[PDB]
Amino acid sequence: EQWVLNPLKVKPIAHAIWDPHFGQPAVKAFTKGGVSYPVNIATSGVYHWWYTIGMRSNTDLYAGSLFLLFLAG
Amino acid sequence: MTAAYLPSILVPIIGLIFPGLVMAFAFIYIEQDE
Amino acid sequence: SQFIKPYNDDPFVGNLATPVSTSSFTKSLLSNLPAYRAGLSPLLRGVEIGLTHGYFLVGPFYKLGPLRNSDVALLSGFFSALGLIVILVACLTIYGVVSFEETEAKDQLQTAKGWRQFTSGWLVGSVGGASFAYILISNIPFLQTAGMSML
Amino acid sequence: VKRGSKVRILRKESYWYQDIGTVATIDTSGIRYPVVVRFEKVSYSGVNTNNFSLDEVVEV
Amino acid sequence: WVTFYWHWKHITIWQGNAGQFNESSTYIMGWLRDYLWLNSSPLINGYNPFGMNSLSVWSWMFLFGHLIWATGF
Amino acid sequence: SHSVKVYDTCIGCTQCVRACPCDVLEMVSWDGCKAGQIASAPRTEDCIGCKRCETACPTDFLSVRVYLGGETTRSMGLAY
Amino acid sequence: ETLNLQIPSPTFEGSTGGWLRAAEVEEKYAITWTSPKEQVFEMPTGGAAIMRQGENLLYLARKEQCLALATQVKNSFKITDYKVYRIFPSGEVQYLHPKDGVFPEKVNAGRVGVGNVSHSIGKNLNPAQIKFTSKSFNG
Amino acid sequence: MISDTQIFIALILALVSLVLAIRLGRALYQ
Amino acid sequence: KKVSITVDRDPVATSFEKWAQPGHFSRTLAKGPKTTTWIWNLHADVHDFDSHTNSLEDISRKIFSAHFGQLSIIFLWLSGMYFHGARFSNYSAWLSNPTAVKPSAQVVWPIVGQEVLNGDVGGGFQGVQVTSGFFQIWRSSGITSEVELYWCALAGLIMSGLMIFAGWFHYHKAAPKLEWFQNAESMLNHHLSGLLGLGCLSWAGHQIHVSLPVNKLLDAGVAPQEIPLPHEFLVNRDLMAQLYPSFSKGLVPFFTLNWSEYSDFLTFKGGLNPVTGGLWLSDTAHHHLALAVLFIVAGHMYRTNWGIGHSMKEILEAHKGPFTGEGHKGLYEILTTSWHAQLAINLAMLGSVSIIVAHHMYAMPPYPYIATDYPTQLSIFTHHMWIGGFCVCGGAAHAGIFMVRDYNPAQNYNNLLDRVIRHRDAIISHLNWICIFLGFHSFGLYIHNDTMRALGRTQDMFSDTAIQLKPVFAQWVQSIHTLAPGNTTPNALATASYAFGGDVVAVGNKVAMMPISLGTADFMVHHIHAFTIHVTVLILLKGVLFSRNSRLIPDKANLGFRFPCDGPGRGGTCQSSAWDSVFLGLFWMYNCISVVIFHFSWKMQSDVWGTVQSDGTVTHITGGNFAQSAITINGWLRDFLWAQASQVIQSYGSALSAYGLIFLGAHFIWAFSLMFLFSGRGYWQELIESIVWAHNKLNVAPAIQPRALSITQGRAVGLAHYLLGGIGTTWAFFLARIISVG
Numbered sequence A: 001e002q003w004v005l006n007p008l009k010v011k012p013i014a015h016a017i018w019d020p021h022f023g024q025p026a027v028k029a030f031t032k033g034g035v036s037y038p039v040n041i042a043t044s045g046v047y048h049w050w051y052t053i054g055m056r057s058n059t060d061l062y063a064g065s066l067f068l069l070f071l072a073g
Numbered sequence B: 001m002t003a004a005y006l007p008s009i010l011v012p013i014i015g016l017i018f019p020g021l022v023m024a025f026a027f028i029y030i031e032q033d034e
Numbered sequence C: 001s002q003f004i005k006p007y008n009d010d011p012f013v014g015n016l017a018t019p020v021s022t023s024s025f026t027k028s029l030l031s032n033l034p035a036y037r038a039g040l041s042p043l044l045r046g047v048e049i050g051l052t053h054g055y056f057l058v059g060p061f062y063k064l065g066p067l068r069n070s071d072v073a074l075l076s077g078f079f080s081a082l083g084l085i086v087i088l089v090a091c092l093t094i095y096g097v098v099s100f101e102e103t104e105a106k107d108q109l110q111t112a113k114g115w116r117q118f119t120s121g122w123l124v125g126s127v128g129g130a131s132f133a134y135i136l137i138s139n140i141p142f143l144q145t146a147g148m149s150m151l
Numbered sequence D: 001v002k003r004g005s006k007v008r009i010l011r012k013e014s015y016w017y018q019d020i021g022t023v024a025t026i027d028t029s030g031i032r033y034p035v036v037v038r039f040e041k042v043s044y045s046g047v048n049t050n051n052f053s054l055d056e057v058v059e060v
Numbered sequence E: 001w002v003t004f005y006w007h008w009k010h011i012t013i014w015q016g017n018a019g020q021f022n023e024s025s026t027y028i029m030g031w032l033r034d035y036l037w038l039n040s041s042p043l044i045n046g047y048n049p050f051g052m053n054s055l056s057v058w059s060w061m062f063l064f065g066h067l068i069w070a071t072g073f
Numbered sequence F: 001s002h003s004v005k006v007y008d009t010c011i012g013c014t015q016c017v018r019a020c021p022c023d024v025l026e027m028v029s030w031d032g033c034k035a036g037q038i039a040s041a042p043r044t045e046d047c048i049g050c051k052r053c054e055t056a057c058p059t060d061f062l063s064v065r066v067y068l069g070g071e072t073t074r075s076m077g078l079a080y
Numbered sequence G: 001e002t003l004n005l006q007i008p009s010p011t012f013e014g015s016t017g018g019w020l021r022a023a024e025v026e027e028k029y030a031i032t033w034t035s036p037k038e039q040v041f042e043m044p045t046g047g048a049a050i051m052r053q054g055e056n057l058l059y060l061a062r063k064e065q066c067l068a069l070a071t072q073v074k075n076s077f078k079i080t081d082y083k084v085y086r087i088f089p090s091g092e093v094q095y096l097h098p099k100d101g102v103f104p105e106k107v108n109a110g111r112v113g114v115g116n117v118s119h120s121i122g123k124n125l126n127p128a129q130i131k132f133t134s135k136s137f138n139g
Numbered sequence H: 001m002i003s004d005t006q007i008f009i010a011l012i013l014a015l016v017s018l019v020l021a022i023r024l025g026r027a028l029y030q
Numbered sequence I: 001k002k003v004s005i006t007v008d009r010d011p012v013a014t015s016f017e018k019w020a021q022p023g024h025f026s027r028t029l030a031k032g033p034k035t036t037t038w039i040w041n042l043h044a045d046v047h048d049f050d051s052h053t054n055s056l057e058d059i060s061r062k063i064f065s066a067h068f069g070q071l072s073i074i075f076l077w078l079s080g081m082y083f084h085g086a087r088f089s090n091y092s093a094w095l096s097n098p099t100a101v102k103p104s105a106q107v108v109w110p111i112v113g114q115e116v117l118n119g120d121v122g123g124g125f126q127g128v129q130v131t132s133g134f135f136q137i138w139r140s141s142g143i144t145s146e147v148e149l150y151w152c153a154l155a156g157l158i159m160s161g162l163m164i165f166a167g168w169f170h171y172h173k174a175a176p177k178l179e180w181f182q183n184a185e186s187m188l189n190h191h192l193s194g195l196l197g198l199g200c201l202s203w204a205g206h207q208i209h210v211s212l213p214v215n216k217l218l219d220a221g222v223a224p225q226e227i228p229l230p231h232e233f234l235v236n237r238d239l240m241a242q243l244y245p246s247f248s249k250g251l252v253p254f255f256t257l258n259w260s261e262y263s264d265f266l267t268f269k270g271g272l273n274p275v276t277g278g279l280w281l282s283d284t285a286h287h288h289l290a291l292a293v294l295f296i297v298a299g300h301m302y303r304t305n306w307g308i309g310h311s312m313k314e315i316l317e318a319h320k321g322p323f324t325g326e327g328h329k330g331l332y333e334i335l336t337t338s339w340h341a342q343l344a345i346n347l348a349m350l351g352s353v354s355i356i357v358a359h360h361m362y363a364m365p366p367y368p369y370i371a372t373d374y375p376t377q378l379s380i381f382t383h384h385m386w387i388g389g390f391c392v393c394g395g396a397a398h399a400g401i402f403m404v405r406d407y408n409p410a411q412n413y414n415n416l417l418d419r420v421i422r423h424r425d426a427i428i429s430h431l432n433w434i435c436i437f438l439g440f441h442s443f444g445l446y447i448h449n450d451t452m453r454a455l456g457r458t459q460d461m462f463s464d465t466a467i468q469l470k471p472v473f474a475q476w477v478q479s480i481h482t483l484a485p486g487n488t489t490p491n492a493l494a495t496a497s498y499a500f501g502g503d504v505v506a507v508g509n510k511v512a513m514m515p516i517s518l519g520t521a522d523f524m525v526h527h528i529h530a531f532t533i534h535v536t537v538l539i540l541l542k543g544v545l546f547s548r549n550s551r552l553i554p555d556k557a558n559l560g561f562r563f564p565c566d567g568p569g570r571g572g573t574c575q576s577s578a579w580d581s582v583f584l585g586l587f588w589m590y591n592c593i594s595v596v597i598f599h600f601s602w603k604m605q606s607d608v609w610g611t612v613q614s615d616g617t618v619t620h621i622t623g624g625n626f627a628q629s630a631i632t633i634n635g636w637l638r639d640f641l642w643a644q645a646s647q648v649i650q651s652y653g654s655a656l657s658a659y660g661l662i663f664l665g666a667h668f669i670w671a672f673s674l675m676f677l678f679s680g681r682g683y684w685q686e687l688i689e690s691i692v693w694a695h696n697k698l699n700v701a702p703a704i705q706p707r708a709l710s711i712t713q714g715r716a717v718g719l720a721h722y723l724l725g726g727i728g729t730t731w732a733f734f735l736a737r738i739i740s741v742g
């Protein structure tokens, strides 16, 4: 939702990092993306694809995740 | 993050308990004869 | 005078009787050690080996661990030793399940019941030895340091 | 065929299949492969001669 | 060869310096110094004795790939 | 075990049996070739799969043919 | 015929290349031979031993180990008197080599050909033909 | 933003998918 | 007089007939080729003399004459180095200004633009900069003229002609009998006393009468053409006594045993000459005189023709204890009837000596102005490390050839060989364990440091700023060697080397030598060295001990030293020969020596080499980055390979562009090797079948049937290209880096 507001400036987040081997410099170094936790920045382009096909909010990305869990079942 | 507790709860379980348990069971299954 | 001879007076066996392998000192030490001690129950064999191993596991985790510089270094080291004990006791359990067919006799480690008794003793001994190391290091300041308390 | 003639091999798994060798001898007994053909080229095994049947050998 | 070509041609265009590819791609030392050696520097400085940044993970993966590759030998 | 086959192109040269390090092959009477003998494999359980018999075969395509199959302690060459 | 367990063994100072726990729990191989001399040979498992004049007995972990010594004893010392046995942990002694008293390289009556295929190797069936059927590829 | 309840619904549906995955794997294994 | 000269006269006729029949030397190859494998089999077995002939006499004769041919090639090579120094060099310009002029003895022709390689090396000269250290040798010899370099080139040419004549003469006219070659006592007496002892004595005499006066005049500041010619020191004993006043008394102090008179020119100074940064040549003269006395004395140990002396058979057969059976009995018989056993020992020793040479020559620079010529120091260290490693693996190669071929169990019952083969599982299992332990505890420390540094945990690393793995024993030995002058070597004035501690020796504002401090990074890279040496020993030893038989292949000696496999059975016996352990251990030798030369190059640039600023500050070449960056693999990648490969990559259009070309060419050759290493012969033979079809279609099939290379040859070609590619990559990288920055 932060990225869709400003897609050329915000760096897309793939998922967060919870790694008990990290030092505090590592935790600070990965805390980009405008959030308060370490993150991987997505290189998959899924933000640009989901933006282009209609998805606007987290609720509809989540609704898509739920629908795919149903389809997987 | 919402449900921020879940990464602390699951990542050690999925990353240590899951392999340990499935390796232990896989070891038992590959070694067993009947 | 020859100090190396064929093993067990059998030349074609794949071993050589040597001073390191077959001295009276080596034979005495192996027999004295709990794993090969005669007259020792498999559970008791496991308790003695476990007490030894759990006792010395705490120290490397405590002194060289991630939380070594913290005041919770001993608790982290004990927990890390305990976690390693639980992983190893799982290894002992799974080895026992696959290796040994179930037999009534339990008087030997190389039996399903005997290895289960050994694993039981090793867990009790290892947790107790790790605990004993924790109690001793906590009480004694010199053990908390690396021997530099005198300095 | 006859001894000394030049022959073309028709055994598909031969090294010298569709190559020319020359017949050394032909047995007269109940032998399964009587035509002994020698070849200028050597096989991968280094052998330069092999026994063949009549229906695997044509005069050239 | 395909992804080295694509990536070098694109990073030179994305700088505004497409002529650097135009002059250096015609010999192999241009590919070695101007693509592999020149662009290695943000990657291999992802950690150093002066700190680390969020490219440290790729800095560790790059060495990890060199190890696996050599272990294959 | 491995499967070892002898084809009727065998000239009875006895070389594959001599090559055999594991006494897998032996000679039996056969009227097909001039030598009066053909190789046989009544002991393919001892066959390690070395394929020394194939190397010794002077036929254009080896009459003796080892086909590596199920592995055992014997066919793996395990002294343990 | 049966292995005389009391046959004396060659003088070997021992080695680490000998047999392991699988010999006493799966199978062991023995080779016996008669030597005219007190002579040094090379063990398949290591260094050098001395075969005694008269009858010798060996314990090896492999049949190839036994047949390697058999070739060394036949090519260097000309012993043709070697018998190779497979001894089970049960105590059963299985005679192996030469299996019917005559070497495999010599023809013998009463030998039945095993593994013999009536056609040449290029007449083997293609794998597609033998697919999803139990029929064998050798015709 | 996603609620903890929404994450729990996703975890319920993934558990149902895990059970169906176990059932397919056992059926394929026979 | 049982040691006698015995020769067969006119054994072999000098005819060109066998030249015209390639393959004449073996029964297999003499019937001519039928496949292209014959062509390769010709070169592969040519020098394998004991594969052609049964008799040890003809083998020994072929070896003796081939050694004269090798000596002829070495003398021709030396004569060429002297001629290129005389004719195509700036040696005379370098003599006047050794610290500014760069040595160059190779000039290229202008053909295809390649004349850019004639760079401006200095002294009004253009040529390829040379790094073999010949200029420093010639200045140490006292040559001081290109005319004398022409006379040395002619002396090398005359020696090359005499050695090629002697090889012809001793194979074709007067070839010694086997009983001549089997005189190990006589040969050792002569090679200790005569070769090494009179070699040192004559060289010490040359140093005292030529090198010492000329180099005193050179370091006083006298120009090379103002220096008296070297025979004027021999005659004018008054002029020689000006420089060294002990010459006023002559040889009376030597014979009367008043040797402390000769302390002017036979010193024990130690350390380096401050003017040149090299060893004091008075120390080198005393060194060679002392070695000459012991080498001559040593060459009187063995019994030849008069009852005095040792029988080496008696020495060996008496050394037996309770652990080792019959002991060294039978080893004399081995070493006087097997050439491969002798070559195994002598190659391991020559390689060890070459490795010792590289360490000692960098630490104690022996030539004037060689220490501050950093391209030469890096080149001769790297060269003698590679010659050492190759020769050590050939020692194991010919130990394997001895074991497969010349070993007889009947003559080796219960001796040291029998006992080693009879506990080879214990040897190889303990070596295997130590290599696993030492790969975990040396390289895993690097992986720990990579991980912790990547994780932001700089306090959790093995480093000088974190957990300190200090090399306390190496630091302590350095302490002892710094305290040794005046204490445990009381008559020494300076330390044996400034690497141990002490002063910084600077020549032309560049560091000649300075203390090499050892820290956590040095502990880690030395245990990397111990690990890579251990694993190379494991592969080579496992090949020697299991060359004749295994539990896998019980009759491996019947297959030979060099066989590819014994089939896909027993699970697969690919690379089961002793040859294939030499093949696998030459890679691990490559790995070992590559890390040694990388450790040397980075440590000397980071902590030793550089410029001495005012106040004695030393600005090093890479600015002391070894300590905090050689503890991680990323540091070796970044701060050593990436940082220092700048010169090879950016060498185009300069005189070092040849190094950029060889850098790329050797990357190519290295990669090209992996085609031979990762592939197998059967693919290439079926591909050749399709190509043979295309030739048959055009009626252009060759009569020598093309074959894919043998399995062993595919391995040998892959290894040869891999070594050439890797070493050539390092050669180009090292040389462009240190010519640019040092």
Ligand code: CLA
Residues within 6 Å of the ligand: I076, I077, I078, I079, I080, I081, I083, I084, I088, I106, I107, I108, I109
């Ligand atoms: C042994 C070490 C050695 C080495 C590596 C070199 C290397 C070199 N020398 Mg030096 N040189 C040496 C010894 C050496 N030389 C000696 C001992 C002398 C004194 C006689 C000289 C005198 C000398 C002079 C005077 C010059 C060189 C030059 C050169 C360069 C080019 C030579 C060339 O292109 O020839 C190519 C010449 C050919 C005829 C082509 C060779 C093609 C044939 C086919 C060779 C094949 C050999 C044959 C097949 C072997 C089998 C014999 C047969 C019976 C089968 C090159 C850097 C030149 C240089 O530096 O210029 C700046 C130069 O002018 N050299």
Ligand code: CLA
Residues within 6 Å of the ligand: I063, I064, I067, I068, I071, I180, I181, I183, I184, I186, I187, I190, I191, I193, I194, I195
């Ligand atoms: C004191 C006498 C003496 C000397 C100097 C040598 C020297 C040598 N021998 Mg030995 N040898 C000797 C006695 C001697 N031998 C005896 C008695 C025997 C019989 C048991 C042998 C049997 C023998 C064998 C079987 C072999 C050698 C080999 C060698 C060469 C080793 C390679 C090397 O480093 O050469 C480089 C060093 C040099 C100094 C080259 C110089 C060459 C000449 C010959 C040295 C002597 C010149 C002369 C005496 C000096 C006069 C000084 C004058 C200017 C005042 C070397 C030339 C090996 C070899 O390479 O064969 C050729 C070899 O295979 N020798």
Ligand code: CLA
Residues within 6 Å of the ligand: A015, A016, A017, A018, A069, B006, B007, B008, B010, B011, B012, B014, B015, H007, H010, H011, H014
């Ligand atoms: C298959 C795709 C996939 C992948 C690769 C990951 C990857 C990850 N997830 Mg999971 N996740 C997924 C789908 C996936 N997720 C789905 C669909 C959901 C909704 C239920 C979640 C819900 C979820 C939670 C709630 C959490 C993670 C977390 C994590 C991270 C740590 C691992 C862990 O604790 O797992 C735990 C994951 C689960 C218990 C859910 C099961 C995941 C999928 C459905 C399993 C599918 C397996 C795959 C298809 C095939 C399996 C066989 C394979 C081995 C060959 C890791 C980045 C943790 C995290 O974010 O830490 C940073 C965490 O706390 N995940």
Ligand code: CLA
Residues within 6 Å of the ligand: A020, A021, B011, B012, B015, B016, B017, B018, B019, B020, B021, B024, C061, C065, C066, C067, C075, C076, C077, C079, C080, C082, C083, C084, C086, C087, C090
């Ligand atoms: C992928 C998931 C994963 C996770 C979540 C962890 C988690 C952790 N690792 Mg890591 N580790 C992993 C994979 C993982 N590991 C792998 C793959 C390797 C090999 C490369 C390592 C190698 C490694 C090393 C070398 C070290 C760690 C350490 C640690 C601890 C962090 C430091 C700390 O706060 O100390 C506090 C830690 C404790 C107080 C220990 C708690 C012990 C647990 C809670 C007991 C668990 C019982 C056990 C799992 C029973 C399982 C039985 C089996 C059937 C599953 C933490 C427990 C450090 C460590 O051990 O800490 C001491 C450490 O030194 N790890």
Ligand code: CLA
Residues within 6 Å of the ligand: I078, I132, I133, I134, I136, I137, I349, I350, I351, I353, I354, I357, I380, I383, I384, I387
């Ligand atoms: C492929 C073989 C090869 C090649 C091309 C070179 C090339 C070179 N060497 Mg090296 N070397 C090698 C093998 C090789 N080396 C081996 C195997 C050894 C160990 C013995 C050495 C030991 C060595 C030393 C000790 C020195 C060189 C030097 C040199 C350079 C000048 C060449 C010269 O005139 O030497 C001339 C050699 C000298 C002037 C000094 C010789 C001193 C040694 C101790 C003489 C010993 C001779 C004796 C016969 C050895 C017998 C072996 C012993 C174990 C019994 C040149 C870079 C010199 C150098 O780097 O200067 C910059 C130098 O000082 N070499």
Ligand code: CLA
Residues within 6 Å of the ligand: I043, I044, I045, I046, I047, I048, I049, I343, I347, I390, I391, I392, I393, I394, I395, I397, I398, I401, I561, I562, I579, I582, I583, I586, I720, I724
């Ligand atoms: C004093 C040293 C010495 C001596 C006398 C020998 C002598 C011998 N060796 Mg030993 N060997 C040595 C050193 C030595 N080697 C070293 C240092 C190694 C380690 C690399 C080996 C490794 C070795 C093995 C593994 C084998 C031998 C074999 C042999 C025998 C025959 C070799 C032959 O015909 O090749 C003829 C020569 C060649 C084919 C030359 C090709 C070699 C390379 C590819 C050429 C190098 C080119 C150049 C340096 C770089 C390329 C430059 C490019 C840009 C143009 C012979 C007994 C073989 C044998 O038959 O055993 C009995 C064998 O199997 N040796």
Ligand code: CLA
Residues within 6 Å of the ligand: E067, E070, E071, E072, E073, I432, I433, I435, I436, I437, I438, I439, I440, I443, I444, I447, I535, I538, I539, I584, I585, I587, I588
């Ligand atoms: C970079 C690549 C690489 C690596 C890592 C190895 C690793 C090894 N080689 Mg190999 N080798 C290689 C390339 C490599 N080789 C190549 C290119 C060749 C070409 C010829 C060979 C040829 C070769 C031979 C011929 C021999 C070896 C041997 C060895 C072993 C040395 C003993 C040792 O250090 O154990 C320590 C293990 C390592 C250093 C591996 C790295 C592990 C690091 C420290 C971290 C461990 C990670 C940890 C397990 C994570 C666990 C969690 C995870 C599982 C989830 C080891 C298994 C020798 C051997 O096996 O006998 C001892 C031997 O004789 N190698």
Ligand SMILES: CC1=C(C/C=C(\C)CCC[C@H](C)CCC[C@H](C)CCCC(C)C)C(=O)c2ccccc2C1=O
Residues within 6 Å of the ligand: I675, I676, I677, I679, I680, I681, I684, I685, I707, I708, I709, I710, I711, I713, I714, I715
């Ligand atoms: C390419 C390749 C071949 C084919 C290579 C062949 C047939 C070599 C032929 C190359 C030409 C015919 C000659 C080579 C000449 C070179 C230009 C320089 C050679 C220098 C020396 C030979 C003198 C194999 O036979 C092989 C076998 C086993 C493992 C790997 C491989 C493998 O990789």
Ligand code: SF4
Residues within 6 Å of the ligand: F006, F009, F010, F011, F012, F013, F014, F015, F016, F017, F038, F039, F053, F056, F057, F058, F059, F062, F063, F064
């Ligand atoms: S080798 Fe080939 S041909 Fe000779 S016998 Fe054995 S099978 Fe028949």
Ligand code: SF4
Residues within 6 Å of the ligand: F004, F019, F020, F021, F022, F023, F024, F025, F046, F047, F048, F049, F050, F051, F052, F053, F054, F066, I569
């Ligand atoms: S493969 Fe080796 S063992 Fe099996 S038959 Fe052919 S030769 Fe005898």
